[PDB]
Ligand binder design. Structure first.
Ligand SMILES: [Zn+2]
Ligand SMILES: [Zn+2]
Lengths: 115, 115
C-alpha cells in the first residue's frame, strides 16, 4: 500500500466506492467521471505504478485483471456488444493516478479511431 | 490458425510485415495505418478472436503480450515518456480484425480523454 494513493485508500475503506468485483488480489470499481456509459477501473490490490513495473515476479496479476474485466463486462450487460480495455503508463499517456489499472469501457459504439 | 485471418497470414509469411519482436507465442508488428508515431500490434500466434475468449486454459498469453509490449516500448524509445495499451472486443468497440491483439501506442502526448 502507498499512504498517499487514492486507490489504495479506496481498498482500505478510507474512501467510498461502488465495487463490482473483489477478491484478495483485485478490485473493480466505478469510475466517478465516466467516459462511457459503463466505465469500470480494474485495480490490483498491490500498489504498482503502471504496467512498466510488471515483470516475471508479479505478472500473474494481469490474469486476474482480465478475468475480472470479463466477469464485470458480463455482469453489467456490455460483454455481448463488446468493450475496450485501456491501460496507460505515464502522464504523456494520460495517467493521473499512479497505481496500475485498466479501464473497462462499454455501452456506446466507439468506432474506428482508437486514439 | 484461421485461413482467412490477415494476422495469421502475416505470421505464416504469406504477407509482409515489420516485426519488432517474435517468439513461438507472440509477435509484434508495425501497424501500417498508425494512429500515433509509434503504433505496434502485439499479437498472440494462437488465433483467438479477442479477450472475451481468454480463460483459465490460455490466459498465460497475456503475460507474453505485456512482456513484449514493454520490450518493444523500450526498443522504440517510448518507454520513458510512457505509452497506452488498448485491446478491443467486438465491432462496437472498433475491432475490425478478429484475432486478439493489443495496440501499443506512444511518441505523442495523448492527454486526459481516453475515449
Ligand atoms: Zn495505490
Ligand atoms: Zn488469426
Amino acid at each position: 500500500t502507498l499512504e498517499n494513493c487514492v486507490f489504495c485508500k479506496i481498498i482500505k475503506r478510507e474512501l467510498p466506492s461502488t465495487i463490482y468485483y473483489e477478491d484478495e488480489r483485485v478490485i473493480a470499481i466505478k469510475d466517478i467521471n465516466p467516459a462511457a456509459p459503463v466505465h469500470v477501473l480494474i485495480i490490483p490490490k498491490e500498489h504498482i505504478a503502471n504496467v512498466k513495473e510488471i515483470n516475471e515476479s508479479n505478472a500473474q496479476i494481469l490474469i486476474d485483471i482480465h478475468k475480472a474485466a470479463n466477469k464485470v463486462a458480463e455482469d453489467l450487460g456490455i460483454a455481448e456488444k463488446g468493450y475496450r480495455l485501456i491501460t496507460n503508463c505515464g502522464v504523456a499517456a494520460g495517467q493521473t493516478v499512479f497505481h496500475l489499472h485498466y479501464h473497462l469501457l462499454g455501452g456506446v459504439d466507439m468506432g474506428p479511431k482508437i486514439l
